[PDB]
Amino acid sequence: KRKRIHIGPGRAFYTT
């Protein structure tokens, strides 16, 4: 889904 937040290249939160 689109819960994952991509803050920068290669880095994300809510990646579960």
Epitope: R2, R4, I5, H6, G8, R11, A12, F13, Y14
Partner: antibody, heavy 124, light 113 residues
Framework: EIQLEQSGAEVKKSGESLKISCQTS????????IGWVRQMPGKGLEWMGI????????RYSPSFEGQVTMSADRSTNTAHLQWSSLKPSDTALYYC?????????????????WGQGTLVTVSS | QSVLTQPPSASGTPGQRISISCSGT????????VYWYQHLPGTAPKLLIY???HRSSGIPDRFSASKSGTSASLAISGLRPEDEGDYYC?????????????FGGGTKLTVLA
Amino acid sequence: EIQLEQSGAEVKKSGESLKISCQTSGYSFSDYWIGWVRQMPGKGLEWMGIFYPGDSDSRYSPSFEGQVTMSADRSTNTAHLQWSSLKPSDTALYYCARLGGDYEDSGADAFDFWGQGTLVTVSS
Amino acid sequence: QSVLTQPPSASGTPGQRISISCSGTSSNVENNYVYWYQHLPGTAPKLLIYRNDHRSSGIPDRFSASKSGTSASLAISGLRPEDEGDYYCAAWDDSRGGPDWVFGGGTKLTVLA
């Protein structure tokens, strides 16, 4: 076609409760974060927080923690911002926005589709 | 860390190129994605640029952006009267170990009449 539609202008007296609304159109409401943005009179845009309707997860900016409550109901595709006790300093323009962009196969990172805003005036 | 600084004001005459600067920190502009917004009278903030330097679909070629170090910047060539309004940079800030969104203080762009 994606649209967020916010509720109308509010003129309130201090201490009064208020829930303003953002109803979304054109995508799966559960699947995306909704962000909230305040603009005080004569000032710049300021981020309040984000809410995930799918599972009610949330992130609040430090200054908004405890001052306001983001919610949603998935039965109506409506995101909400609630104050039980409106203060004069809450007087502002409030925007709702979807966190999206769909730049990759997964996730999100830009506030792409915005509501038209809701003005809130509170006086004591 | 969680602060994007922009100059308050900018201006040019129709047909000129202008540049709007945005200054951040190691927790936002330097490594994280930067975005640019237009805010015109009567309308919601509008995404121009995403992830440092990509034009949002439908945005004209005369809008562009870049960043070096802790600074980012938005350029508008072929300045037109309807460009007049507020421009904001924004970035993901990771000072708290999570995704916080920060807006810069914004810059008022006047198209000189």
